[PDB]
């Protein structure tokens, strides 16, 4: 079980983001009541740091 | 914390007056120029019996 | 001892705060009290303690 050492790999990263339930279904629902509008595919994400 | 609770509105008195142990409310004003201060509190008791 | 606890923690006044209290900063416009978990005022309400 007891690992030996560890590689990584760095020049993609992902980012695991929290979001509270409410306030997702909240805007999915406004998304699929016409008062959202979505562009293209994935949205943009961006970062601030500490 | 927006996981667990909600939120709404009310309405509430941010100044709350008591007089002698009873809930009060004090109206504060001076009389005309032209007359005397006693004949306005017989017409503000006079008033205030209606 | 449990049931002690449970009333001391559930029955208890917490002070909230205020929207838009002191120190504000440059450009509120809202400010207003904050209502949160009171003392319980009836028979109802204090057997739903959990």
């Known amino acids: 079980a ?3 050492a560890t590689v990584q790999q760095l020049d993609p ?8 339930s409410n306030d997702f279904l909240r805007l999915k629902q406004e998304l699929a009541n016409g008062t959202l509008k979505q562009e293209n595919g994935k949205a943009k994400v961006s970062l601030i740091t500490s | 914390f927006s996981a667990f609770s909600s939120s709404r509105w009310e ?3 941010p100044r709350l007056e008591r007089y002698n142990g009873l809930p009060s ?9 032209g007359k005397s201060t006693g004949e306005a509190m017989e017409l503000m008791e006079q008033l205030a019996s209606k | 001892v449990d049931v002690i606890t449970a009333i001391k923690a559930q029955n208890a006044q917490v002070a909230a705060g205020q929207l838009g209290g002191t120190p504000p900063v440059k450009g509120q416009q809202l400010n207003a009290s904050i209502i949160a978990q009171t003392r319980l005022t009836s028979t109802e309400e204090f057997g739903k303690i959990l």
């Open chain 1, 13 to 20: 990263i992902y980012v695991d983001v929290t979001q509270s």
């Open chain 2, 25 to 33: 409310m004090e109206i504060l004003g001076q009389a005309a120029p």
């Open chain 2, 11 to 13: 309405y509430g008195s």
């Open chain 1, 2 to 4: 007891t690992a030996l």
